[PDB]
Amino acid sequence: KDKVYKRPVSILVVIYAQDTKRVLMLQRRDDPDFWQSVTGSVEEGETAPQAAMREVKEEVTIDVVAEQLTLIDCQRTVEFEIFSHLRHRYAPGVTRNTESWFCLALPHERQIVFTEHLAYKWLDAPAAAALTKSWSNRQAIEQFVIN
Numbered sequence: 001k002d003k004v005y006k007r008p009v010s011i012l013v014v015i016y017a018q019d020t021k022r023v024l025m026l027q028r029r030d031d032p033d034f035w036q037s038v039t040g041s042v043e044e045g046e047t048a049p050q051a052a053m054r055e056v057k058e059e060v061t062i063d064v065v066a067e068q069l070t071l072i073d074c075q076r077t078v079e080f081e082i083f084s085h086l087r088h089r090y091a092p093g094v095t096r097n098t099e100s101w102f103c104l105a106l107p108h109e110r111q112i113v114f115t116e117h118l119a120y121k122w123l124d125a126p127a128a129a130a131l132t133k134s135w136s137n138r139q140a141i142e143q144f145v146i147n
């Protein structure tokens with residue numbers, strides 16, 4: 001029919017490489033100035049962990065299950081004003097988003113087959129955190145990568 005609305009309940013997955021401690025920063029198609037980790041709405045009839053896994057498979061082609069990896073519940077939920085210029089993707093009146101964090105450590109840096117984004121960079125955590133426009137994404141990387 002149309003582009004049905006994004007649900008204001010979403011997940012964030014902080015991917016980083018264990019060996020280098022570099023962070024995967026993907027570049028958004030709708031705001032090419034916005035660099036971020038993996039995000040996505042938590043669909044109707046699935047949990048946040050299942051959403052995290054589903055988002056990582058879609059956005060960056062990595063099967064957590066197939067590659068036997070550990071999807072850590074980073075155990076933070078924050079709430080923020082959605083960026084003015086992206087609000088339109090949400091049902092009328094919706095201005096705030098609820099976001100739960102997950103961190104995922106890959107054994108090495110790799111080539112990424114991104115499907116929805118323009119590009120990826122592997123950055124050092126401080127550089128990553130300064131880059132993103134998302135204050136939560138920024139905090140997630142500070143708390144759980146820079147440590």
Ligand code: NA
Nearest residue numbers: 039040041059
């Ligand atoms: Na997404």
Ligand SMILES: [Sm+3]
Nearest residue numbers: 040055058059
């Ligand atoms: Sm997605």
